[PDB]
Design a protein around this ligand. Structure first.
Ligand SMILES: CN1N=C(N)c2cn([C@@H]3O[C@H](CO)[C@@H](O)[C@H]3O)c3ncnc1c23
Ligand SMILES: [Cl-]
Lengths: 113, 381
């Protein structure tokens, strides 16, 4: 009803951040597939550990990239009237947080004991 | 690549800066990320050696193998009070090799150790490459700056860092002397001039009193607070918002490292906004336990939260005047150095102490040392 050209600028920044989240989430998906591969592979217990702990640097790099997205989102100031922008920002933060929760479960499954 | 000019390098504790004198003016050179300052960070990974912004950006990922603060170790003995006190806070290992400290890391799967001047040489090599990428010419000659309180051993170790980095160190000059040269205080007509250099960074606070008589610089005194900087002002804001969140929501965010980091980053940026505006707004969705944190802070509240810290910057000023055997009325020029001198309240306190005397602040305070060094590098070329 009162959609402004100024909000289109904010929606564009959020769309560029959504594309960045989708790139990091594809890396997380590859990490999940490689983890399953090691778990359902023929590696002896000792070499499995090296393979699982080799995923650690990668998982930590995924967490960090998600943290940097959150810091970029946190630079935004959205007036109350920019309802669509506030919804897209909130939806995007919750999505990054759900992926960070998945990264945390991977971290609790590698380099253990 | 053709042979290029001589550069001025401010080799800093947490950040370094490189400048060049060309077409009658100094140009502060931006790095590959477009930043006019470069982190004095070196990281050792399983495959490569990262320097500068690339090393600082992966610090969370590789805390033990990411080295910084090598300036606090350079030219010092292992048993130095400074070395013993500072290593209690570093995430990387500091070992003793025949009385000399060495940083110990895992580099390409092997345990390796480096002397502080070897780490500083890697930072200098990065500064050399930043200049070379901008100029499109080979850079060999440099003027490198050191603190006025550095002894013979710390000065020599810095020159050795320059030599290992493949630089021809034209001169090692004091950081307060470099700031005074930037403003041409040695060229002003008149009698000897008493200059006060007020340096406030992210972690260190240094006050220096220089006398310039017939183009000769003489350090009369140095004072300061080695652990006082912008980071202390961020901490006060973080504590204020943690308390605010507790008052409103009855929840303690301080044990969630990621919530504290999101808050800290927002605070540091809000602090910078307060140097030009009287208010800064912060909006952080789902900060802790799904609660959105939308707030603001005025300059007045930021100043109240840091009142003791700001006022406290005047005690090393009085200490320096006492040691230099000078009254405040005998100070001809005051020079601002360091990012934190941009804070309006600090400028007001310093100006009121000198009964309304104008401050030399037109040159970016983060770049003033590099600026004076580039001028000196052009003079010696
Ligand atoms: C406006 N404006 N612009 C800056 N570029 C800057 C850097 N700083 C601080 O100086 C330190 C750097 O050694 C860190 O603690 C920075 O937060 C600042 N404090 C206040 N106002 C500032 C800055
Ligand atoms: Cl430039």
């Amino acid at each position: 009803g009162s959609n402004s050209p100024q909000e289109e600028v904010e929606l564009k920044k959020l769309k560029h951040l959504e594309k960045s989240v989708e790139k990091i989430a594809d890396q997380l998906e590859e990490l999940n597939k490689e983890l399953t591969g090691i778990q359902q592979g023929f590696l002896p217990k000792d070499l499995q550990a090296e393979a699982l702990c080799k995923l650690d640097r990668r998982v930590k790099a995924t967490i960090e990239q998600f943290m940097k997205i959150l810091e970029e989102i946190d630079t935004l100031i959205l007036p109350e009237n920019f309802k669509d922008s506030r919804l897209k920002r909130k939806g995007l933060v919750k999505k990054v947080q759900a992926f960070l929760a998945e990264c945390d479960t991977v971290e609790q499954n590698i380099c253990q004991e | 690549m053709s042979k290029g000019p001589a550069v001025g390098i401010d080799l800093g504790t947490t950040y370094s800066c490189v400048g060049v004198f060309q077409h009658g003016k100094v140009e502060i050179i931006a790095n590959d990320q477009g930043n006019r300052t470069t982190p004095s960070y070196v990281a050792f990974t399983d495959t490569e050696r990262l320097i500068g912004d690339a090393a600082k950006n992966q610090v969370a990922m590789n805390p033990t193998n990411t080295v910084f603060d090598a300036k606090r170790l350079i030219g010092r003995r292992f048993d130095d009070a400074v070395v013993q006190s500072d290593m209690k806070h570093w995430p990387f290992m500091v070992v003793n090799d025949a009385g000399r400290p060495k940083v110990q890391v895992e580099y390409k799967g092997e345990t390796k150790s480096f002397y502080p001047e070897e780490v500083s040489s890697m930072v200098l090599t990065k500064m050399k490459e930043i200049a070379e990428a901008y100029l499109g010419k080979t850079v060999t000659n440099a003027v490198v700056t050191v603190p006025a309180y550095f002894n013979d051993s710390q000065r020599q170790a810095t020159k050795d860092a320059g030599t290992i980095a493949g630089l021809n160190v034209l001169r090692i000059i004091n950081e307060p002397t470099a700031a005074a040269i930037a403003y041409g205080l040695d060229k002003k007509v008149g009698a000897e001039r008493n200059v006060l250099i007020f340096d406030l960074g992210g972690g260190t606070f240094d006050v220096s009193i220089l006398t310039i008589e017939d183009g000769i610089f003489e350090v009369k005194s140095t004072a300061g607070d080695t652990h006082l900087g912008g980071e202390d002002f961020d901490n006060r804001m973080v504590n204020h918002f943690i308390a605010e969140f507790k008052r409103k929501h009855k929840k303690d965010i301080s044990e969630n490292k990621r919530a504290v980091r999101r808050l800290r980053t927002a605070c540091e940026r809000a602090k910078r906004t307060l140097s030009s505006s009287t208010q800064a707004s912060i909006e952080i969705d789902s900060l802790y336990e799904g609660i959105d944190f939308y707030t603001s802070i005025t300059r007045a509240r930021f100043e109240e939260l840091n009142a003791d810290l700001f006022r406290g910057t005047l005690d090393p000023v009085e200490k320096a005047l006492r040691d230099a055997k000078l009254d405040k009325s005998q100070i001809h020029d005051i020079v601002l150095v360091g990012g934190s001198t941009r804070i309006p309240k600090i400028q007001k306190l310093l100006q009121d102490f000198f009964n309304g005397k104008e401050l030399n602040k037109s040159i970016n305070p983060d770049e003033a040392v590099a600026y004076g060094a580039a001028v000196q590098a052009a003079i010696l070329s």
